[model samples]
Target: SDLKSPDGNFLMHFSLEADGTPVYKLIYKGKDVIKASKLGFTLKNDNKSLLNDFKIEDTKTSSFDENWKPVWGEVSSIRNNYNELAVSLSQKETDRKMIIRFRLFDDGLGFRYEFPQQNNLIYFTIKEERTQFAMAGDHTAYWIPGDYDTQEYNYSTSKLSEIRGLMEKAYTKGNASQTSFSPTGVQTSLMMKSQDGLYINLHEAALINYSCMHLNLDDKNFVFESWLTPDSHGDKGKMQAPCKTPWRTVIVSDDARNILASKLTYNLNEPSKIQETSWIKPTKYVGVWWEMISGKSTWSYTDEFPSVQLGVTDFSKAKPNRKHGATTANVKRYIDFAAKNGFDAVLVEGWNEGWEDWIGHEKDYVFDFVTPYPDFDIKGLNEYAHAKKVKLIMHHETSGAVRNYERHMDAAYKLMKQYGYDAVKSGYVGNILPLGETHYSQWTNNHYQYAIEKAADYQIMVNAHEAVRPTGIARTYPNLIGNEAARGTQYQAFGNDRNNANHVTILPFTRLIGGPMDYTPGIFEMDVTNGSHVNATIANQLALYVTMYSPLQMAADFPENYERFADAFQFIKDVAVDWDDSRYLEAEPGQYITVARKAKGTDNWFLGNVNGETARVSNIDLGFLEKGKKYTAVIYADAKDANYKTNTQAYTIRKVVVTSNSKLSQFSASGGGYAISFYPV
Candidate 1:
């Protein structure tokens, strides 16, 4: 392959064919076709004007490869699609999305992708197979679908004997003196090693909507997958199956880009539950969260009287305070009170084991992510929260079994770097199955960029939940933070359903334009942990720490419900978690949302608002302030009959003084929200 690269995107080429029935190819513009097809009826294009001539009509059929086999598929191969060399990204923009793959040289090179273009939805399926192969792991091609019809797989083997040497696990031993070349430097790729032991490597368009399948493990530690939970279980689903398990997988490399990145986990079967140290301090930090259990615990359809919240223990043990084993020790005492109030991080939820028994005691969880939950000592609380510098933010609940969690990803990321961890959270709970109803949905975001290239070759940094809902892959894995898939506020704190707090003004025009949203808003303990009465107050949780934007930001609330609101925890400790600039200013989903964020070099700016019931007003441009400075605005309001309204702990704090053509007026009620911060003076 002579360092293959005529450049236009085509270096990750996999193959196998000659009576094993698995083949993959790529070379976009220069020719060479047949990308992925476990028998989806030999590629059809309906002429989008020849979709740029991928040249069909061979239907090689390998003499009718016999339905990509499965009743123990007894081998069949096909390769020769050669033309290699190319890389081009032009999907004619609709806000862009494309991932086309193929790498199944006789069932093991295993890969198949394609799926993007939502709402009009395109689908591919086949029950996302799995028998858990070592002997019959359902033959390759893992998860897919960043939009529309789901697909997934973990194990698939059956080409009866004569299997070209199997079992390879390397994890990243080739750097070649790091070469990325020009404009932004950094694109060196090479990690082969697949006679079957599977070492494989090739990643581009990194990951956001979804792509993950990094394995590389003989013990070097590497395991990943952030989203693939639409559902595909196995043993034909006559019971037992919970995304076979392999959720926590974060890696951020480029020599740990600005520190703190090294969270590796395969979990359950073990790979360091939370180890490798320095859990977080990277870039900027501030967090706290415990999101979604329906109104914060107890899967609400309408709370108490529901049936629609079934299985996987109705969203894993429906917790309010089940205290199911140190239930994340109230998120480690709110990251030890956000490291004694200076805060840098803290995000927790029902605590492990496929989520509170994940979907009806799915046989009492342990989809393996480096096993822990015997009582959550996650390595003596990661050395007592990195000795109070505070950390530990990892989660996984594949509760659908993407081919039995990619078949024990090297005992779960070598025990997640032997116990030091550095930020992780991945999930995908139910419903996935397409391809005339068999499995594997083509390159579907290449298993979430093979789990962000195994978390950027094991540097660690990820947060994904529910699956397929983002589009920005965090500008190419900027540690790929946040994604809850949306429908949050813990379903309005357990489904009292006030239109889910007007669906947070309809997620910044629907699912935050595709990125950042662990949707774990600062909870100020949502009306004292679900006693009810919180639609908004305490100034709408101080305008969700500046209208929900995240760079791994969390504050999901719990260290004793914010120690009696130290003046709304001083606006969640003066907002700002990460933002170089953002402005939507005014939106109208369920009725309100004002936004603004700026913190790159910092002159200071942070505005937030919410109101969905009545009494509303806006008009305070100040052009995001700072045109020859003059600032100092710390306002927080609700007054004139405000008792914190229904008690957000009797709020009020002021500091007014503005400039840059200042002209302000703001208000909220009938289930409100608000927050402000300016600084520079």
Candidate 2:
């Protein structure tokens, strides 16, 4: 332990070693700043000093025999009670005169920071209580809990023993199976898995010399995963705020030139080559769940019922016809609509062999890949679509059989390419494969990856549905446009536990953090027309085109909705499938969200806002814009006289001259929302 600062109110350094290795070091300066760092581990800081004149009671250790192997780790405790940890910290990883502060409050801990040494350092945080996480600088993100990652969200606890043990077990298994990496000290890459079968064997490491993964987890549900990239400065990855009581923290040092201090091993005893190809787009298009259940139609709704998820009372018993039904004809009509409307692709679900089992158990869900629909001619339709400069997006719901479908994949992809179909949609529904094979693991990912890689060779894109959630896979495979790894709008048709409206707010932080999600949006209205059930109104559906972010976006729901609302159609046609930048203006999980995205080619920005039920407004800062440019804003808000409760068409096309200092206030309808398109003048 070292002495205090000149004022004597702070401690210069205090160190503890586990046998021979340095473990804990806490430093304080005056009455404000405090910093803590564990060697070869995490560095943290605290603003809420729990100890004004408090002292460390003691440090202890214990050992447990788990199959004869010692499971013992050192523990240090401070005397303060009710002292919650901080997600955002302030301190120096290596410096002097640092102070540690920890204070407990009802909501949680009160923490702050003082960085006298580093100004360019960026701070990060994880809001444990809300199961949300975020950071302070750059477009970088590591993990956003609960909102994405099925396996990660399933993990309810943040116990250190559990996490560390999981990582260790995965590394050990990889080593034994010959799949482990031989780390070269500065860069460590290895295959790892979680208890729920999450395969993280992909490559990840510091881009250069100085990089750190900022992790935080506590009882408050604050679990954030952030990282720092080195700038030109030698101290690029320095902490804006130091690390402290984050429940648990781990850091791997590649500075020692040991990629793996341990030897390489593999469980399979054979090299599993990871084929990284194509740009991944992690979302896709699908039919609207809204129109199938409600009898009225798209946009029109009765005061008797409004929610899109309200399915027909006897939907299970009803034998709705497909081929001759208005629904089937309407579906085909949309394909033509998309092609003429300047759409790049059209996603038609009920196109292939198996139609009955998926719907009304028609063919026992034994959809055949070879047979063309009786009404829709594959060759002629393909020729027509291609001649019109639009490609058909084929959908394949394989019942989750991986290898079995591989046989059909090649021929299907080949035929699609010849027919001018460059993109396809595949789904893995029902309970995955047997054993621990496909339920959730790298095996499933490998299969999907192989499929995409194969398609890439043929220059075909893929969109996976009922699939696994993304993990920055799109950064590598941009052609993999989207996937339905989470509960999507389709659930609204069959279950009361609908994910629509609610899931939208949290996705930007969670599922979307990985990349684009194909929650096939654009159902302008639902279930009110043609004696159907389950759907949204015209305005609510139009919001999907703006609310959901996907490269392979869909105009779901009935074609009649699009045809009726030509004004709303402009927003869909105007919005970009790709973007230059995106910003989250305001967010409240399951409540409301506001986001703005910049166009890639023009000086224009599109802003979309969604709310669960309550209508409210927030003053959004347009600080990201240039200082003196005037912006013309075309706006859409819920109309008062709209028949559908989710009706959103009371819109205004207006102009506003504003700068970065301008403030944009928004309005929401009860159970509704708004969207806007702005271009610089």
Candidate 3:
């Protein structure tokens, strides 16, 4: 067992084999990035499958360094430096003991599977998770299929032997637990690049109670194993010895912007068990939700009970269909336009009462998250967004009925702490009710961390949606502030285009590598109210408020489409859902990214880019702007004949004056993008 990260440019080697199996490999400045592979776990009704006879018995190594601070992030410091190894192993015919550990990290390697408190293996189950990666060839990855209860597909670059011939639909048959995938499986933070350039990724970290990894491809020896996510009694992880599993990361980089600025999945999680994090903030708002994801409105206020039951079918004697979208004067006109646009919260998704049938019925009292229909009052719209000082987010959907959302989760977080709603977007769509569970099943990923530790015992925050697909657990529950688990932006009006245009340029390197992605990215009407189109370009939806990083930012369309684009809704009201400094100044996974940030304490900076269906230009240099400072930038472009878009909400907005060696050059269109903002002048 040897390791060498903390900057020797990575070297990991760990061996065993010749049947006592265990193995590893990786190299990095010298290239062959991960070639040996092979790890354990296989057992369930076993033929003694803890994989092999095992045998090492002990070995350790360490060296760590630190620096943490992120009660809100993108960057306000994070550098957990690493180098560790562990090993242990001893299953000499079931006398059982295990360990494996590893940590490496100058950019990545996480390994895990511990188990200690053993009396000959206290308990176990897992028929899978054989680990492996071994790929020094046919790289190009960036996949999506492997479903056991959806991770919203759409991402498919192929190679690694063209992923089982692109699985006949890159993940077929719309799986909301409709389940059926695995041709070469896929799903994970699984990025990849290689054929010489090397970018690699592969994900998992802090996925509590385990079982949510996916990879599958042996594709004629291009290796890649670990498939986890199981349960309809097929068992995949139920271990319980002194438990551990959840850290199989990888991450590498020949610099795809250092795999989107890796913090190695928030330094392999485990920190703030909510020792009070100042009411978890970093959020921007505006939501009634795409007027019902674009059918113009209807989270059912009454289609006259085509199906209804909660507390015995009677949503106030049923009858006010009137286009429903969380009314109460459309949530007091989004709480008077989110306190005249200073926005900090105003969500309101169908104010409770199971939107009628609540999804093709697996029905178990579908949503009692504090019933509330009859024109949605929810305590005077949380006292009218706390008298417009604004703050009212609550929207639990729970229709996969996880024990009816853990029995209406502490009275729906005690009605959001007695009517002041700090935050809560949740939603679990369908299929998961204790009947053989599966939504990243490890008992449904511990019911989304028991509603993020019961919304941190009511300081409330969570953001969830269709559940499970966030793994840095917000650095150990920073109230898990957001997770639509990808394919977001209401699937750009849920259709076959299924949200593409390089899908946020391969989602910050695959489902944002373990966290932050409520990608609701503001859409300025490119057809919705049921016509379904939104391919983006209102300056790529204001560059997804700066490259989809999310601290729960949402201005999602309508307030009359942000007053018909009030200067592109003032860059979604000036942008900045927290950041102290972030700068992947340019990227390229499927096409482009660019970014900039720095607005947590404000010298105000913003930048952002996006572009993917091709049409570029970009060139930059405000030198991360500050040296010799002088600001005022603004930009927000895309209308140089809006290429490939023909118009797509043609935009422009200008203003100049800059410094720190200003250089500029922009353009972007073809699923357009752009947005700037600097300030200081």
Candidate 4:
């Protein structure tokens, strides 16, 4: 049997092989996109696994069409149209039943394993998911090696066969926690381009109560099998009957922009769980985080002791090291800056008590999340920010102590509501605590979900850093405002080998396919406190506000850096965090991207063009604007002499009046970009 997309472009075929093994394949416009791939699972205890020895019991087909609006999103409304094939299979010997439900959307296909409540399959465990994605050819793949603990890896682009050789270098040395499964294993959403110019992406969606999924490639055969992250005892997932696995997605298109614009991931997730979303809001702000990340300031208050135990550590009598970044006066300076500009909030990190011992000390408790250091005035700081019509974003660094964070999370969120704080940027920076567990373990993923649900109880939004790579969970929980699950701008200040000019271009098609990324983009000063330098141009930094789509955006540079370039900073001030519509002007996997977005309630539009390692000219049309209206377009472009290595600061800005049919051409330098703003006349 087969399921087809409404547009007559995508086709999905399902079959049962001679050995009673289930298999499926996909076709895009009559071209083979995925060859015949098998599907089944290996169970933990049963000697006769669910892999084979089954017969089709019944099959049902249906179609769905709906238009839904997100609480906050890149687009105001989305169309979710899909056809489905649900296959019911019964094992010959045991009579156990399992239904493989497939949803074929116009953009892609999403399928999941469903185990209806039955007598023989009441309780079970998953050893591994045995779904396969057989590529049509040896595609040019951009991937990160599979790791259970972290998704902060810089990507490697190569042929499918070349990944084994590149894994040693791509799996770099300095991660805090890691567990490599196989040389050919890679993380998702994996981006690949075939020899015939087809773009294919593989990832999962609507992950709930299950382990995260990775893909292990058989490069010789060009097949990829689903590999789930395991728990301490090495079980992939514990399960009960009547539960469904996450949707394994295969998005294929000949046009690359369609891949960037696919809403299948969000469509697979359930609608918002919270009734009242008025408390949630999109934010654009500045922060005190960059100085500490660049090593100019410290996260701790003193250098006296190696370990400071909470409740027993006396800090008022200790001398201040003067490098403390979260002191009241310094924070008030950021408050004044945000107030002068039109920022919604200001973020201050390292205002807490445990950074000295907690680079990743396995203490019983590292952070209370409510206690502030002596120099930090929690009460007064919130009052000061509220008086200035700005909100203060709270920071909670758990130091990987999951149990500790769970214990104190309620008190911390309560403290936040008591003050004026409506959002918190929470981080899990070090190794996950409890020696046996890994970062993406099913248990830890549950902990992160628990935290999100708990925050919803308090109506506080979360910007989770170093959390699990999102699988469209934000569609269900709108309070999950931002995620830093990929290699972000902070990596620009890291080691030399981690420096790659094409990093940002690959992310929108890869990491951001699931949710918005808090890339923390606006860095004006290329040179930092350490010997390293931020790699992108000032115009490139300005472009990220439009390029990286997030409900939570930050101006992640020092105040002086923005003051040095006042005119360029106005783009950051004018850009919108919420959008009514978005258009992918130009798209490719590893090279370049041009995006235009119309603001939520205004007639204004903003554009961003991000370049790779080489210089190129970008051309776009103003056709998405109003047809009869005149508008002023401001172009912030990379200078002719701009190079990221030496001439990082060079840029030019110009204004021109334009109509709907007008076309513009702009140049971006190597490791540089351009940004534009359209205002109605």
Candidate 5:
């Protein structure tokens, strides 16, 4: 069987090998995009492959065209249009049945496997999935080394043969699981550029209850096959009948901008499961977190010593460190800042009783999630925040004890509701409780979704950290506002090669495509003078608010840091988190990204442009602005002498009056950027 894109620019062919294993090939505009690749899975009990000997039983075809609105997104609404094909197959050896489904869109394609209930096969353990992605050529690729425990490494851009010797780089040194490290494997959301100038992206969508997939390269054949993280018992996945795997996606385009414009990832997910989504609010917040990361304060309540303790609630009897960042006075100050700056929520980490004995050890019940330390007054602070019209966001640090977290999930959420908290940021920062389970294994993957669904019942939003990378599941679970699955701004404080000037440039085409990221951008104090410093100019820090697509954003620095550069901080105060319309003026994968977005339900527009190490000039197209309207453009740009290494805080702000037909040439300094606010005159 074969299918073509709506415009006939791409073609897909599906067939079976002589051994009865399924194979597929892809073509884009007369060029081979993917050579014939095999697809099948191995069962744990049976030595033979499942679906290896299959016969076509039936075929079904369909099409859909519709438009739906997002709660908040790059645009107000998106069009869901695609042609679908379902091929039913029967295993000749076992008389079991399965179906292969492919949804062909104008810009890309998505395919998945479905297992139907049968008399022969009821329950099975998947030892391995053999899906292959054989590339047509050894193209240029932007990728990170595969690790089941972390996706925080810096991206490497090179040919397949050039991606060697990076395993011991120690990028995610302290955070990743030692058991999940792979020397040569590559993580997905893989972006590549063909020698002939075609843009291609390979990823998966709606990843739930299955091990996250990585690609093991066969450099000799220019091929990549699916490699899944295994559980404690060395199985890839466990499933019964009437189940489906996530969609393996391939997005293709001649222009890189079109690749960013495709909604195929979001379209592949199921619809929102929550009937009432009014409580799922997108927001910007300040927190008592950065100070702790900067070493100004600690999370412990005792200055005495470290001990082996789990679930001991007698924290008030211990000696006080007096440097706790989550004190009542500290949280009150944050609430004042957020309320004064038009922000929606305030997050306070380390407010609970278990921070002292939570890390570098093995124990269950590390955090009860409902117990607050002595200095932290959760009741008093919640009351004060509500009186000021700001909500208090909850914090749950599981300390890698999944079983413990699950045991107290209900009670913790009950406490949150009682304290008027509608959002929670969950963190899993150590080894899994089952001992050998990786973060990307099937069991842990189910825990991530289970947490989201459980939170949805209480009308609370979730922002996950140290979880699997998002796969557009937020479209279905709208309450999952953001994720910290990748290396974010805090990496500047720890990682050897932290997020550089070009890091934000490549994220939109790669990470942000799957869903929003809580990258926590807004840092004005470029020079921390300690061991860490933000490597970009002050304007670039403000520009992240517009460039990164997170419904839940963070003004991540301390309140004092913003007060230092109050003039430049005005842009962060004015930028919007949710948008009605967006336009990508110009972009290349790792070079630069220029974007303009209209605030939802408003006439004002915001613009941002970020440049890499090399300086570049961009011409403004006011054509996207409202027609026949005069507006004042507040421009914040880098000073001529400004460089990321020296004079990073040097910047200039100016205002100009312009109309829709007007044009301007903007200069971005090396490793710096610019931001603009267009207010109608």
Candidate 6:
């Protein structure tokens, strides 16, 4: 069977192999995009793959065209237009049944596995998923190594041959999800440019209650197959009857901008499960996090208590450490800063008592989330923040102790409510508590979702760090606001060859495709001499607020640092976290991107233009604005001498009048960027 786009440009062909294995192929404008690829999984006990010995039972086809509104997103409304084909198949011998559902859209296609409530398939353990994406050619690709534990590596761009060689470097292992995979493995969403200039992206959608999928490559044939992270016992995933796997997405476009504009991932997902979404407000926050990461302050109550027994010792009575960043007085300072700057909340890391011994020591019970350090008065600070009209965002670092966190989660959330905190930042550092289960395993994947669902009961929002990369689950649970699933700005402090100049340019098309990334971008006062500073011009740091799409954006640098560059900070202040509409003006992954967004409820628009290592210029058309209305464009651009390597802090700001018909020429320095705030005059 075959399905084509409404415009008759994209085509999808599904057929059964001679051996009864299912195969799929995709074609775009008469050009082969995805060559014939096989799909199926293996059952553990059966010791036989689900690829063959299958017979067609029935088939159904349908089409839909509708529009839906999101509580908040890239656009206020989205068009749900797709034609679907469902093929029912059963194992000939046992009569075990499964359905393969496909939805073909104008720009892409999504397909998933569904098991009905049948007697022969009541309970099954998937040993492996054998879905393949046999590429039509050796395409240019941007990818990171396929690590089961973490997706926080920097991206490497190359053809399949060079990528295989790049993966030979040893992975730096530290966090919960930090394990190396075979040299052939790579993670998704895998962005590639075909020889025909077509953009092909491979990723998954609606990831819930399943192991995160990575891709293993075949360099000779340029084929990519699904490699699901296995559980402790080496099982891919366990499922009961009436369960469905997440949608495997393949988005294609001749124009690079259209790939960013594709809504295949969103359309494949179900509508929001939460009816009362008014409480799920997006926020901009300043945190006591950068100071800790920059070595100016510490998250521990006392550096000396690295060996304290969790239940045996009482931390509130312990000696105080003057360097702790989350002190009651320190948080009050942040709250005051938030009040002055119109930020919604203040995040305080290391407020809890167990930070000192939580990581690196392998303690079973590291944190009692309800207890605070002696110098940090949680109740008093929350009240102080409330008086300033700022909420206090909580911190829960699990130290990769999943079981412990699960055991105390209910009580921990209760404590958050008692302290009047509505949002929390959860971290999973170190290895998993169960010891063998990796971070992206089915068990921990379920654990992450459970935390979000549980937080919903307390009306709390979540900003997860050091966890699995988000797969658009925020649409279902709006309270799960943001995630730090990539190599964010904190890597700047590591003082090594990490988070280079070209990193941010590729993220929008790769990581951001999954969902909002709390990259913590603003860093104006950078010191690159020691390699521990941001690798962008001061103006580029300001541009990140517009370039990076996160509801929970962070003014990551300290208030004092931002104060030193107060004029440049104004752009960060005026930028909006939510948007009514967005436009991808120009983009080339790993090279440059220019995006414009209309503020959520206002006529004001913000534009961010960034370039990688190679400097470039762009003539931007302000045609996205109201046609006849004049707007004041506050332009923040790279100074004439600004270069990320030498003069990263050089910047200039100017004001100009512009309208829909006007055009502006902008320049970005090497490893630098620019930002523009457009307000109605």
Give the number of the best model, judged by TM-score. 4
lDDT of prediction 5:
0.85
**Model 4: residue 132 alpha-carbon error in angstroms:** 0.5
lDDT (Cα, tens digit) per residue for candidate 5, span 1-681: 888777788788988889788888889989888889888788888856674788779888888989888887889999898888888988886888889898889878899999987897788989888888889888988887887777886777778766655545634466635454456688888888888898888899999888998888888888888888888888888989889899999999988878877888999999888887888898989998888876678877776666626444467777787888899999999999998888899999989887887786766868889988889999999999999999988989888999999999999999999999999999888888868878889999999999999999999999998889889898899999998887788877663666766887878777777898999888777655356877788888878888887899899888887888889989999999999988888788888888889999999999988888788887878888989899999999988888877878888999999888999898887778899999998
Order the candidate numbers by TM-score, best to worst.
4, 6, 5, 2, 3, 1
Worst 10-residue lDDT window, candidate 1: 259-268
Instruction: Answer with 3 or 6, whichever has the higher TM-score.
Output: 6
| Per-model CA lDDT versus the true structure | 0.42, 0.43, 0.82, 0.90, 0.85, 0.85
Candidate 4 lDDT = 0.90
lDDT of 6 by residue, 219-270 (tens): 9888999999988888998989899999999999998888887777877778
For model 6, the run of ten residues with the poorest summed lDDT: 168-177
**Residue-level lDDT tens digits of model 2 in 1-681:** 343322233232434333322222222223211224332222334342221222233322221111111010000111112222212222233222223232221111222222334443346332111111211112111222211112212111223224432443222211100111111000111122233322111122111112322233221221232222222221223334443221211111111111111111110011112244322332223342335334333211122222212122222333334322223455456557776576665565545534434422112224445555444467776676567666667767766556556777788787776777777788765434442233233345557777776877777777787555554344344466677765455544443433334445545434443345666566554443443333333445545555566666776555667778778777777776655556656654445667677765567778777765555775788876767777877776656444333343454444566777888776665445567777777
Supply the global lDDT for candidate 3.
Answer: 0.82
Top candidate when judged by lDDT against the true structure: 4
Writing each residue's lDDT as its tens digit, candidate 1 over 356-448 gives 334532332336566544345577776777788766666655554444554554456556566656666766554321222112223433454
Give the better candidate number (1 or 6) by lDDT.
Answer: 6
Q: Pick the winner on lDDT between candidates 2 and 5.
A: 5
In candidate 3, which residue pairs get closer than 3 Å at backbone N, Cα or C atoms, i.e. clash?
none
Stretches of candidate 5 above 4 Å error?
166-172, 176-178, 308-313
lDDT of 4 by residue, 1-681 (tens): 888988889888898899889999999999998999999999988988998888999999999999999888889999999998999999989998999999999888999999998999888999998999999999999998899888888888899989999998898867777789999999999999998999999999988899999999998999999999988889998999989999999998888999999999999999889988989999998888888988888999988886788888888877778899999998999999999989999999988887787675666588888888899998999999999999999998887899999999899999999998999999887778877687887888899899999999999999999888998998899999988989898988875754577788899899998999999999898888876778889888999999888999999998888988999999999999999999999988778889999999899999999898889998888899899999999999899999878888999999999988999888898878899999999
